[PDB]
Design a protein around this ligand. Sequence first.
Ligand SMILES: [Mg+2]
Ligand SMILES: [Mg+2]
Lengths: 146, 156
Amino acid sequence: NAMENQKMQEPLVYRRILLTVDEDDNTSSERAFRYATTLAHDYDVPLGICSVLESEPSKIQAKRKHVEDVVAEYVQLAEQRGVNQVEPLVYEGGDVDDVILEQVIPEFKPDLLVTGADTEFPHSKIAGAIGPRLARKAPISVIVVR
Amino acid sequence: SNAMENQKMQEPLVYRRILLTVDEDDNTSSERAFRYATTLAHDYDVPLGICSVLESEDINIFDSLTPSKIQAKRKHVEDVVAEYVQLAEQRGVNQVEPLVYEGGDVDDVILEQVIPEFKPDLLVTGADTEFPHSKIAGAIGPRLARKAPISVIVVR
Ligand SMILES: [Mg+2]
Ligand SMILES: [Mg+2]
């Protein structure tokens, strides 16, 4: 038929994985974490775990510590899972979508963004689940995990 | 995390039943979508279904050219799905099946017919996959990522 046989056979493995997390607990966030860390473990590829502090003082440092703690806990669990290279990616900005698209993706250079279907940030310019928005707008592959 | 939570967070996640959604166009995103789905199905030994949704003839549109146009489009999409199935078998996927459906609302066909029948836990599609015949215009992947009850990867 019409497709190039050899090219269509080449394996595809994602080389640099970015997991985006919020502070909430739910089945989608658990499964997004497990997918990203299973992939990174099984194919021996780097994982970045990102969250974003939203622009609004012992209060601001407490909010910052909270985001840092959420990401640090996920990194610890990823290390326990056996992922060889995992790093925290805590970023700050006005609109989370732009922070991810304009700062995190270009700096960390992932080829896959993973996030749970429930992940959301209350002061994002567009309200609601960030995963499908990123699936539409990002220049890389995006999986929205449920 | 408490002990139970820690253990649950550690449990491997390997998708069990993969649904690849395709249109007739051969582009970078569709090639990579096919390669990701078949690499997953091969490396983890899980079933793959390869789906598309055909346009049907409209009983209120009667003319000499429309039937040929629609029939030839249907056969083209059937050919593309069959070729993807053969390529997946050549790739070494043990269980791969065609899933050709039809209807005017492709989102609804996938959500209400294909997913409940094939029972995938992951839907894969290229970022360019689109069905201009359908109710809603533009790339279907991000809409399915929003609406589906299962995980959806939009591949670029
Ligand atoms: Mg291990
Ligand atoms: Mg069956």
